Design a binder for these strands. Structure first.
Lengths: 168, 164, 172, 151
DNA sequence: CCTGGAGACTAGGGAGTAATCCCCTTGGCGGTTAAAACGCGGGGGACAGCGCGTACGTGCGTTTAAGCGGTGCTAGAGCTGTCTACGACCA
DNA sequence: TGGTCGTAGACAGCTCTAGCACCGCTTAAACGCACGTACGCGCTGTCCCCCGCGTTTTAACCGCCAAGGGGATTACTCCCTAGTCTCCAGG
């Protein structure tokens, strides 16, 4: 269960992000407890990605993550990234980042410190992490949504979300 | 692998394209080429690659679109049609993903299939834009268009695109 | 959907074999129409695999497939395998395989004929084919069983396995 | 072929196949992750430092012990050389082959003991495929590592 | 005015081709048996239907923290010349 | 075990630029609180279609058995391609 994965001490994703994500996935409205499983999921995914990123880091002995690092991390997991560094209708057209940005730099710094490598990070890697994490989470929510329809129910539930994740 | 000029050249459907979209489609095509050539490497049992191998590798692709593609390949090889992408850059990216021997006929076939998929992607984008009127093809015109067609998504899908 | 995949005029898997497969999945009971979706699913997987194997055979300027062709196709599906040719609860320990051998050979011959290739098949290629197909079908059936339990129900219906297929793959 | 010496022809074939598959996959991962022209044992060492649990810690500790010391190293270096050279057009060194031999023999030991435990749970003194199937399914981390395959 | 590319050859090494004998498949025939298919209460899971409170959709105020730069800065990511040191290929 | 041979990835030194940290401001969203209700839960009372059982055809399978056919093997030829070359015309 993802319930044990979330802990106390690290930074908190605001709930409004959760309802916005559910609206993006097409759901009607969120339940009173759905925040914890989704926050755990996003935290664990970012943990895995940043860990593989540090794996790439240790190879070149550098101390800043470049777009090459994040793209290698994405591809070794077999994810074809296409981004480049260079009431549902109310947000269907909108494709901006739905999460505040400073929160994830704070998360990245904290997880890197927890691993034990205070390392500077560039914005392009942040954008790549943004897109990959949003894609994964919207996929998972869509899976849960079709499951909860399949149960002849018009609502989402923590049981639904965790069984959807397990179904992978 | 910067094919943007050839994209505009092979795109007669004006509708001035966002600079980002050229990079997106460039990544799209280069990923297609990489996956399909790793495919060709894993399927072959002989040291020298052959054009007919690529033909068959595209033949199993579901739908009459594969037969259209191979018809275009025959046309460009000998029938009536020419190519616009450079052969040399394609050969370089070819060598970057194998340790075998490759003839020019395979290069011609690969350029033809790149022509073909570029044509379908640009026309699908323009059709989706016309469904949404206005102009100036945007990123949104790719997603829910690749998702619009059943076969494209059924064979490409997966790949993460800007937002969702 | 999946039911449309099957058509009148071709051989079919025995119904009792389907029932044994569902029991091997651990399901205590099933609806009366469960045979059709799994028949379609196994036919579709066999069709794709045999087409890919035929392509591999054609590449080598060959006239009859070997275990090498099948293993190359298997690596092609990004699906590893470690095989080399060289009441209900008291049943999972059984390793004996379900679908009869000659039925599967007849299926292969028909699906090759529809491709216009009277190509002989070696028994090692068979072994690989039925083992991989039973693996995929049992995995799908287990996922279906899980999603049925999640529905706060105790049996399985055709809509259930349809949903299971919809989740695992993409559209159509 | 030497797994029997480490310790049922079919089970030996299965263990050899799964070992060579793991070696091939790890070599592919190492080749694709590195950016410099040649690879060192440190690359595989870091590849070890991602397996959650104390088992990965023992894996890397034993790799380090083999590098500093000798342990056993009964595996043919030429066979390993053939295995990665068949699927790599890059540059290698002997430290890497020693490390990969150590890690593969460690995995062989783990799977052997898991099979023995599973067989003893079923009251059987022989090696059979159903026992290794039950063992590989039972362990969580091995199932996560080997779930992609089938046998 | 560059530069990469349009010819040139040129040999070898793989690519294409022919023969062959036997192993491995392939088709067929037969015996029968294990299995596959056809009824049967029933009863138990499913489902139509009734009832609710409570979890939650929507609305309102408020803050406080997130974004947009603004700026000084530094550190540390690249760029560019050694060398010795560690594989490779040989005895 | 040793020769050498090579080339190449650490190494050091420079540099300039891009993250970084803080400042500050401002204002827009997160959240907490009220209210009123839609629905998932919960229960109920009947229902009909799998599910064990039983009996009763049949054709999968195995074993043999002949047979043949093309496949792994060997031997032969050749021409196609990388692969160096080269200098030179188009860009």
């Amino acid at each position: 269960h993802l319930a044990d994965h979330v802990s106390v001490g690290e930074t908190q994703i605001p709930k409004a992000s959760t309802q916005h994500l559910l609206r993006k996935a097409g759901s009607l409205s969120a339940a009173g407890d759905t925040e914890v499983p989704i926050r755990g999921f996003v935290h664990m995914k970012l943990h895995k990605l940043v860990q593989k990123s540090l794996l790439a880091m240790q190879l070149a002995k550098r101390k800043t993550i470049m777009k090459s690092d994040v793209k290698k991390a994405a591809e070794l997991m077999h994810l074809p990234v296409f981004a480049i560094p260079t009431e549902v209708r109310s947000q269907m057209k909108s494709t901006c980042l739905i999460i505040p940005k400073e929160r994830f730099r704070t998360m990245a710094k904290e997880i890197s410190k927890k691993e034990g490598h205070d390392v500077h990070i560039a914005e392009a890697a942040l954008d790549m992490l943004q897109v990959i994490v949003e894609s994964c989470t919207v996929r998972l929510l869509e899976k849960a949504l079709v499951i909860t329809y399949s149960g002849k129910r018009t609502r989402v539930t923590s049981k639904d979300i965790e069984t959807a994740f397990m179904l992978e | 692998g910067k094919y943007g000029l050839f994209i505009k050249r092979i795109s007669p459907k004006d509708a001035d394209i966002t600079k980002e979209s050229l990079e997106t489609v460039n990544n799209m095509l280069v990923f297609l080429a990489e996956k399909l050539t790793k495919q060709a490497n894993i399927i072959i049992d002989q040291k020298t690659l052959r054009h007919d191998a690529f033909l068959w590798l595209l033949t199993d692709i579901q739908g009459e679109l594969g037969k259209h593609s191979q018809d275009f390949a025959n046309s460009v090889l000998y029938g009536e049609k020419e190519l616009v992408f450079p052969t040399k850059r394609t050969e370089n990216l070819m060598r970057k993903n194998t340790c075998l021997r490759i003839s020019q006929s395979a290069v011609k076939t690969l350029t033809a299939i790149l022509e073909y998929f570029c044509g379908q992607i640009m026309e699908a984008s323009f059709s989706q834009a016309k469904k949404s009127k206005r102009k100036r093809i945007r990123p949104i015109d790719i997603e829910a268009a690749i998702s619009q067609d059943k076969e494209l998504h059924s064979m490409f899908g997966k790949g993460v695109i800007s937002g969702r």
